[PDB]
Design a protein around this ligand. Structure first.
Ligand code: SRM
Ligand code: SF4
Ligand SMILES: [Cl-]
Ligand SMILES: [Cl-]
Ligand SMILES: [K+]
Length: 538
């Protein structure tokens, strides 16, 4: 690989980072949007104030403003649902480690409540909140309200660093390796410039997913992140081995590979910065399907990429990976739903099932109430789109289990519900080929009526090949498609995936059977469960 390939392609200009003039040939349309106007100006120069005053029908009449609402606003965590909920915006937070407060939860509930049938909220597969129904004129006030309660929505979509995932049991599990909260907090603060915006990392060639591991269970899914910090002692010092480049896409799914690098715990932010700078400076910016960081790693080779990270470290120092990490390969992933003792004597946490991650305003208020009455006002989100309420005096558990809302958000739902994950789908998402959330609940309910089982089978439903619900990690995955019934009529269907494994012995699942009409999935799944997962007909 020639030395010319290593010339940084972006430069700092007036506080923002822009593609150099000589590197603008052949770029994709999204890169052109970013050049035409810097998205971060909508927040950092308060461009949103005047934009929000323009009626949406007028906004749609010019490319600049249409691109503002459809593309640039994703830098402020705002996602126009143009096709399926025109004029309304989904809003996505930064929520490092999935940690929320009751006050924050009530604030979010109050926002969605205003929008009635157009409002609701969802827990995401990055243990994050999304709210729905937002209208553009309300955006300035919502941004202010979020800041007031200690939340940010910065840099949560498009070509940005996504929600930093950690251990949902951080600080409370007797069996944790290291509390991930300080690290995911530091990452989020770095990424967002302490909630002011950080232009140095907001002009990436593509999205980029980070996680910090603190569990033997690998709840954080390090194998499918762009950067995963694996806890490891090296020469008597605590730090992290680094895995890089994991990603899913329609075209290609790849597990993260070792960078062959270890950093002391205090170098978490420095190395995140170095890797992001290398990606920003050097990544391809053509075909959007070839812009994720792994494509750069393949182009330079992992050693070539490593050298680019190393030169961007303070004092240009980057140690080689530790021979061993702290994650024990002898491990059985633990159920976190239900009541579990914390490492703090006399305290428990409770994991509650949130059916397909969907809540209404009234539900959010009730969960916030529980957190205040029983816990410490904390609600934690999980990547299976469930919740944990920590820090509950164990003597209160008996009373808690009698709370009416636990009949809906149960500490012990049927086993297939415990493992069920589903993306937004076509209720709101314009890319979706099928409806996911309602369908997945219906099918799972019917399947569990027919068979009992003891193996914790994990079923993931995703609405299109973007695979936001990670079907490649599932025991049984369902990817939306259109197919045909016996009469040749168009019907919703799924491509069925098998082979996904998580934890230390991870593996990416692959298509097993294409184009199954959704109305025909129940018998197929019942038989798969009996034949491959020890299920017994009722
Ligand atoms: C909400 C969420 C699914 C969920 O129900 O939980 C989601 C929802 C969407 N994803 Fe995703 N993705 C979600 C996690 C993921 C993940 C899973 C993960 O991070 O572990 C992936 C696969 C892993 C990965 O990225 O490597 C994922 C891969 C995509 C892709 C394909 C990326 C690619 O390289 O091709 C797109 C499309 C794109 O970016 O070009 C996408 C695009 C989208 C958009 C923004 C598409 C669009 O604007 O409508 C979806 C918004 C729908 C809506 O209204 O909610 N989403 N998306 C997740 C939000 C996570 C968060 O809080 O930040
Ligand atoms: S997998 Fe497809 S349908 Fe589901 S949220 Fe992602 S982009 Fe939308
Ligand atoms: Cl996006
Ligand atoms: Cl859309
Ligand atoms: K769930």
């Amino acid at each position: 690989v020639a030395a010319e390939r290593l010339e940084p392609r972006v430069e700092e200009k007036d506080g923002y980072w822009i593609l150099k003039e000589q590197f603008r040939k052949g770029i994709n349309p999204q890169e052109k949007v970013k050049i035409e106007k810097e998205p971060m100006k909508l927040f950092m120069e308060n461009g949103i104030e005047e934009l929000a005053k323009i009626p949406i029908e007028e906004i749609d009449q010019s490319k600049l403003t249409k691109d503002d609402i459809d593309v640039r606003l994703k830098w402020l965590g705002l996602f126009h649902r143009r096709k399926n909920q025109y004029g309304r915006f989904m809003m996505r937070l930064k929520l490092p480690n999935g940690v929320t407060t009751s006050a924050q939860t009530r604030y979010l509930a109050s926002v969605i409540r205003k929008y009635g049938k157009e409002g609701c909220a969802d827990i995401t597969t990055r243990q994050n909140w999304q709210i729905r129904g937002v209208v553009l004129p309300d955006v300035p006030e919502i941004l202010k309200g979020l800041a007031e309660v200690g939340l940010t929505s910065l840099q949560s979509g498009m070509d940005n660093v996504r929600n930093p995932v950690g251990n949902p049991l951080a600080g409370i599990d007797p069996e944790e390796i290291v509390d991930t909260r300080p690290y995911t907090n530091l990452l989020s603060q770095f990424i967002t410039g302490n909630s002011r915006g950080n232009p140095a990392v907001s002009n990436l060639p593509r999205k980029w997913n980070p996680c910090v591991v603190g569990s033997h269970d690998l709840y954080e899914h390090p194998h499918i992140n762009d950067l995963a910090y694996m806890p490891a002692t090296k020469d008597g010092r605590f730090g992290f081995n680094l895995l890089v480049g994991g990603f899913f896409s329609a075209k290609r799914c790849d597990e993260a590979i070792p960078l062959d690098a270890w950093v002391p715990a205090d170098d978490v932010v420095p190395v995140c910065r170095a890797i992001l700078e290398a990606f920003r400076d050097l990544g391809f910016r053509g075909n959007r399907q070839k812009c994720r960081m792994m494509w750069l790693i393949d182009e330079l080779g992992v050693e070539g990429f490593r050298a680019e990270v190393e030169k961007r470290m303070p004092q240009q120092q980057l140690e080689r990976a530790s021979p061993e990490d702290l994650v024990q390969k002898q491990w059985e992933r633990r159920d976190y739903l239900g009541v579990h003792p914390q490492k703090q004597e006399g305290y428990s946490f409770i994991g509650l099932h949130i059916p397909v991650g969907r809540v209404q305003a009234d539900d959010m208020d009730e969960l916030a109430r529980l957190a205040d009455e029983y816990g410490s006002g904390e609600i934690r989100l999980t990547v299976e789109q469930n919740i944990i309420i920590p820090n509950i005096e164990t003597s209160k558990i008996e009373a808690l289990l009698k709370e009416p809302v636990l009949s809906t958000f149960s500490p012990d739902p049927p086993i297939l519900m415990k493992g069920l994950v589903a993306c937004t789908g076509n209720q709101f998402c314009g890319q979706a080929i099928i409806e996911t959330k309602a369908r997945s609940l219906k099918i799972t309910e019917e399947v569990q009526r027919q068979v009992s089982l003891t193996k914790p089978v994990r079923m993931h439903w995703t609405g299109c090949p973007n695979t936001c619900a990670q079907v490649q990690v599932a025991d049984i995955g369902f990817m939306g498609c259109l197919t045909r019934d016996k009469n040749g009529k168009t019907v919703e269907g799924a491509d069925v995936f098998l082979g996904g494994r998580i934890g230390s012995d991870s593996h990416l699942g692959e298509v097993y059977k294409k184009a199954v009409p959704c109305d025909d999935l129940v018998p197929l799944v019942v038989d798969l469960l009996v034949n491959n997962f020890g299920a017994v007909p009722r």
